Prior knowledge:
This is part of a larger assembly, with chains A, B, C and D. Chain B is mainly α. Chain B contains 16 helices and 14 strands. Chain B has three domains: 1-128 and 337-458, GROEL, domain 1, CATH 1.10.560.10; 129-194 and 301-336, TCP-1-like chaperonin intermediate domain (GROEL, domain 2, 2-Layer Sandwich), CATH 3.30.260.10; 195-300, GroEL (3-Layer(bba) Sandwich). The two termini of chain C are 22 Å apart. Classes of the chains: A alpha+beta, B mainly alpha, C mainly alpha, D mainly alpha. Chains B and D meet through helix 6, helix 16 and strand 14 of B and helix 1, strand 1, helix 9, helix 10 and helix 12 of D. Chain D: Keywords: ATP-binding, Chaperone, Cytoplasm, Nucleotide-binding.
Amino acid sequence: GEKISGDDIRNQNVLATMAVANVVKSSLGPVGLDKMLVDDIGDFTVTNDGATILSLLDVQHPAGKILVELAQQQDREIGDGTTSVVIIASELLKRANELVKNKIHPTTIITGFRVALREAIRFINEVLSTSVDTLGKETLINIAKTSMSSKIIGADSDFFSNMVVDALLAVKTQNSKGEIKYPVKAVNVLKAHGKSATESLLVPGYALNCTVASQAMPKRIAGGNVKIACLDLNLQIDDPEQLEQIRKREAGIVLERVKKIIDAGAQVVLTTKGIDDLCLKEFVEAKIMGVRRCKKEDLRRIARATGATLVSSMSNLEGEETFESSYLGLCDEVVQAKFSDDECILIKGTSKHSSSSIILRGANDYSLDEMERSLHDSLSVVKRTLESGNVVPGGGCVEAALNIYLDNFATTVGSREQLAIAEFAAALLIIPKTLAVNAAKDSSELVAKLRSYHAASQMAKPEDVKRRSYRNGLDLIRGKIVDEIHAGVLEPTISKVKSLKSALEACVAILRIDTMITVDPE
Amino acid sequence: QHGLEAKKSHILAARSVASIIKTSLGPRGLDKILISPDGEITITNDGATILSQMELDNEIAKLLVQLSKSQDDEIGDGTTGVVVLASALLDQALELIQKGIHPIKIANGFDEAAKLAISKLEETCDDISASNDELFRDFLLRAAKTSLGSKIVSKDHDRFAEMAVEAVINVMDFDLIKMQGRVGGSISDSKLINGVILDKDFKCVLPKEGSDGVKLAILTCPFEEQDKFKEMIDDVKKAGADVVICQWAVRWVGGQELEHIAISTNGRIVPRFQDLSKDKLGTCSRIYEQMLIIEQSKETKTVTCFVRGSNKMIVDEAERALHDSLCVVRNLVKDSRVVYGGGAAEVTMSLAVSEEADKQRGIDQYAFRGFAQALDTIPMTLAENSGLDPIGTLSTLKSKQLKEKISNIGVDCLGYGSNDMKELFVVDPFIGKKQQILLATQLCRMILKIDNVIISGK
Amino acid sequence: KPQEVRKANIIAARSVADAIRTSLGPKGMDKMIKTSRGEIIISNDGHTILKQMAILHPVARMLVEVSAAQDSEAGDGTTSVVILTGALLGAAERLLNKGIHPTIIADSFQSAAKRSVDILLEMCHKVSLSDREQLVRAASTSLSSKIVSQYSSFLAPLAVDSVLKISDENSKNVDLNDIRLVKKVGGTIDDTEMIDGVVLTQEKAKIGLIQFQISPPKPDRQMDKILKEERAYLLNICKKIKKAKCNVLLIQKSILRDAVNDLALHFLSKLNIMVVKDIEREEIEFLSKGLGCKPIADIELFTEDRLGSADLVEEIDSDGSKIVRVTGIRNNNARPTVSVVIRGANNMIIDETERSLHDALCVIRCLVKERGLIAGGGAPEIEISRRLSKEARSMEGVQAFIWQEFASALEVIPTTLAENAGLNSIKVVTELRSKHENGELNDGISVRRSGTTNTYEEHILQPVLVSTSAITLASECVKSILRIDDIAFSR
Amino acid sequence: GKGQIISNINACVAVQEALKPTLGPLGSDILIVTSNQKTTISNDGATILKLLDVVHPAAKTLVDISRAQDAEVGDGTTSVTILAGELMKEAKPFLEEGISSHLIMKGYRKAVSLAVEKINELAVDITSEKSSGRELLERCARTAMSSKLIHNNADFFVKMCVDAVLSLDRNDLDDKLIGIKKIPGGAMEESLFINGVAFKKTFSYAGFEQQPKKFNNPKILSLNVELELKAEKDNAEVRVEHVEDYQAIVDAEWQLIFEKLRQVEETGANIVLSKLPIGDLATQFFADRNIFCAGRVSADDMNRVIQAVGGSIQSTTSDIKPEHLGTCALFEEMIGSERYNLFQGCPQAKTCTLLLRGGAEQVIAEVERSLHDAIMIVKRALQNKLIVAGGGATEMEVSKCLRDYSKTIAGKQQMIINAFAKALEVIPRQLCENAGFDAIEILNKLRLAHSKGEKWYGVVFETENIGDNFAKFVWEPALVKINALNSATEATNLILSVDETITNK
């Protein structure tokens, strides 16, 4: 291998970062444009999420790997707003590379942004406040409409204010020594082709993904305390005498293992593999609902909800094979919903933890994929939203509001970190600047208003009232002065706290880079 | 490339040309072979003429063109090491710029330190004009013998110096005197006449009616056919002129050589044939071949020397030394202030700034000490050529000159057993050391301010 | 060509020694290393740098073994050994031109190294065996070779209190091999805390150890014959374990062939018996010392006596990671083991935290190996060079010029810290030479103030063993290079 | 498009990076390499940009800046010229952005328009102190010594530059009126002032030292045709029958020359000045009269002779008038075996002559630039007396008031004006790199200076700290600072007005 020296090796990663930055900047905001990627098998996919793009982005430089780790980290922290988070780390290296050229030391920018961000927590907490001007569930309704950023389905969020918001209201459970939690993945997403996306229906419970084929299954079921039986077992030579010995015993054992579940009082049976028609005959006389061709991962969520424990095969402490009743779950009722000639099992009234499900409808798989991951990413935001009642004003207007706080903070510290604070505040103006590029607007006209109006409250004395501005602020679509508080646009505190703090730490490893060492692969 | 890295790619190249002529300084120098781009071969032990004509790339050596055309014309003595002397102040600054010192702080540091050592030179300054004509003439004999001529003239300079001093006394109250020489003879066989050397030939002229003159005639325009040809010749013999000078019997006389004939004879040039008269005729003793010998009975302002040597290179080295000898003697009689050179004057200015460094202190403390170390490297050049330890010998001489205020004792350029320059009668012009040591700071003003070099295209 | 062939490798050695100068100090910068497998590894120390660097010159290859000895001792500032090596090789080129034999140059470095150790003993500061005041100040200061002390607030008392509780306050050895560094995804750097017992990487339960693999009779009418015979052998194992009351079983590496049958997990699930496999044999030392578990080769020799003992064993789930925590330790041991679980958001932060914490443990081991304290910021390097400069003129001889160059090479270490911070090389050193005569020996230099100021008041302390081992290992490397006068390429 | 302008500005900034060590006395000389092997090392940008090879056609604007710098102002090539293109450096990130430079050109135009009123507001009137031409011009002369190699020895030049311009008529001041004679070799302190017309260089032929240098009251005489025998005479058609007829041509040419020299001899002039050179035919004729004769008079020399004695070129003896014969009070011939004509006692002469002498030819070339720059300072000071601190620190206090007008914009031009004030911070940044000072330490106290002291903040370089150049007696004409922004306005607006270039072949 060889080694490349000089300061040009840092610019090589910056130019490579700016090359992939402008690619994902086109997906920022609802006015942005989606992109198409190809797996080089001939198949393609359409998604605006940067987490999928960076996962499929091939970068031989270590700078591209940091963006992958940053995108995967924001998935568990937030899960949405990738274009409003990961892209921030792009221009962060651009302005930091400008000062370090001559009169600035690499650690000065590291210590410059660290002290600024540490003191910005109190500045963010000033703007940060509890949810106000919201009645009942309107707190999540106003946030559900904010999905226009990083997700292009935000135009349909008017109808999504019901199915999506009410989905996580019924999953409320109490665990971890009296702590209200919202378990992730508890919402099962189903896909269908037909009608329109406005036909989505919310199920207050888990909905199993399957299709009813054999008509021997009962079409109606009633009664409470329905027992769920999950079984992963598959139930369906020189002379013919040896063949008859193994055949007559196999047919007897398969039908006997079915009767072991019948004696346990199981109302519904979930089998991973297929079920023969002769086995379904015992379910009709015993009033049992048979189900075949089930996914193992889909049955794991049932154990965490109703409590039904999966059984690999019949066995016991002794040599006799039977089925214990302790493996059965608890659910209130079973509902069969037929959607486009496809019937799914709806499980409601879970025991351990309550869950829900959402059925999606669309034209093709690409129309469903835009409605699948996007709405699923909005559920992860609601997970962190209801955890901390404090919220921030939406529209990405908090970056321009904190710029006036950094102007007075730059004079407090000063020294060599004053230039880093000025560039850190100038980097915050790039976020609304990119929003004006895709919206075909004038950035200099909007930024001039972001600096003039939002800084009027800091210059004027707050104790004298004379507020005369709200500062709360902007408008992407119309380029006019309106308020989101009346328009219902608000963002949770997770979009900034525990979000940009880890994103601004990406430049710490970049500024300490000296040279590049590449070893020849085997 | 720009910045400090660009300054090192150029200024540091001055150490290369400094070590080239380092071994050629003084009588201990060695002959170096130089080849011009045109194919000419130049072999001499004088480093002043080596760096004068050379083909180099970096412009750091191009500033030496104005230095070579100055010191050689103004003084000529001790000018062999003027580049090493100029680089001595630069080599000390190369260690200062590494410390981050500003060039103006270096320039003002060496400028003020060089002015403080002038007062020390006034204390040891002597006057050769205050003595009689016996001591004044004797000092001119040993001045260029132990210093100026480095080639073969070490022992034999008594012949070249005596002929040079007598040429100075005759014109004493060189630009109007033409001097040249022919390859042949030896050192002690050189001849001196009053007049200008005429290489063109036509025999002996007898005394005329006037005392000690030939009534010489010079006509620029040729006679202009046979009737007027012999008629104009008889007009020349009317005034008793046996020798006639015409461009188209001495014929084919150069333009500059013809004027030197009229200057020595105090005559006039006659362009026509009707302007010939005894008032326009020059005064010359006689013209004969002993190349025609032009003699002047009365004392005139034209006195030339004829260089003779066994080798063709001796004539070029001896004559060039006479051009520099006339410049040194001119400054000795004009400027009464004189100093003792040959290693004593360079060390003298080093101890002056050394004592003044502890008085000023401040930021200039190490700047003044660097100026002392820069002057200490000058005798180190002659120490290696003479076999003496540069560090060991100077450490002993600085200790002897500490107790005894006389600085004349120092490194001997000749290498003899006498370290006292006053005993060897080594005298250098005070203005000479001023145009060498002090004026070198002016050359450093252009070098220290070098920052970025702009290289254009073709 | 004895001199020219050796000098050709010195230039390549000084080039690597000059490149690693940017990796020293808090103002330094690290390098990016791309492994042949495709994984990116970035570290400030020269351990990974020299490990992945392949140079045909044998001098550059011998620097790996020399640095590896210092990496296991200190771990921070280990590049100064190579920097001092490259400085002595560059200074030996001028000493060799004076007519001095290379072995005499090599022997003069060892003679000056013996005096350097005595200076560190005279400048040795008194330090108590067990204290939380002195050990914390010395721990976070040596970590300045990387970026640590920002988040070390919770990390500094951890390494101090853990090592003292592992063995004792009597110093002597106190090896670090008993420390289990556990890396898990999630959490932050400040969330890293010590655990009172051993934790598992992969209520009142007993933890056993199994060296074999539980499985039917398959060492590494037919339908009913297979089911009955396999379940019979697995049931006999369950009866022996149930009588021993062992709720936690540990299995060796299963990835080869047999692994573990699913039928054996069904019988052990009713008895609430834990099954853990794919465990490296190196973890037995932690299981035998900490949990008192005796390796069990065969089920025939399985009994309760070979089983371990514990008070409370429970499973702790931190950020989705399943970790088995053991509360209390009951066994016969003179050196109880303490495990530390490292938490971090990204793998690059977790990998950097390991080397940052491991180097923080090594400096504590250097304090219990040899007690002492020295000044920071390369200040002791000047006082050692100051004495050798005066002793060179006293002894005179041919070593006077060699000890002067050996003392000048010691000034490169404090000069490197100034060059990486944006300070002039000679201008700062020139000002320090007047300050070293001022501060009077042990008074050190601070990086933030960029000048000479107090050490203990500024929380700057360094162990004496690191400076002693650095000079010793650097001297052995320089004497070996000049002693080899030529190289050869063969089988 | 906008991408081509970025490459055009980077080519202009590339040479400006080397021209940074110019403004201020602490600047460093810049080295150039030409094709003629003859280069001039100086801080002057007019000489460097003239000899620098131009690649892109827009780079020729920098050459026109130096040409307009001397025509509109006359000095500041080491200060104003390098700052004419600094607005394009701060406008470089604006080109990548969608911001149209049309509003940027209006942003800088409105910024420099309000700055002129600020320059006149801070201008101090010295007429209240009754400062004469001594104290006023001496403090301005030391300010002109910035960017010049001579510093410690510049005290001798202050006395020479002030006394030379005061002898010249203060109603009409021009560089072409006063003469400058550069003599290589010698020393700098040997420079003297001449009260009259001086010859171009010198003429040395035949007898040279034989001419006495001490005269009483010579008289100036003007001639036209060249004098010589059968060499430079005008060719004509002459019928030659025999070889002996050539003697008649010699007599016909001599009598034609003799009658013209005998008729003019009645004037009795001791100095003979001809438009062409003088040969030996007139030399021996003038030797009997014991009069001085010098030929090869340049056209610039004759124009200054008319201002004193009032003579005229005489091609014939019939037009000779007594009014064309002047005189002088004293005449002395001045170096390196070269005679220099020096006239004295010419009160009617409207022109002056200064004799410059120096060892280095490159250093004296900048001294000529120092003379041209000092006259423009004296010319604009005597017309209007105003006090402005030099060293580029004048825009420091002005930048604070410029930010006040930006807050009243509330438009796209608000951030444009802030970029103009940010461009003013480049001046102290380039000065810190020249003296090695920390740029951050100066900029921190620069923003804190206008909050307390205000007035004049000069950043004194002698104390290595912050200070005021007003108390240091550093004065600069305000007309140079006012027109400094006008030169940068037309320069910045010209490059931003070209979105593409066209090159044929």
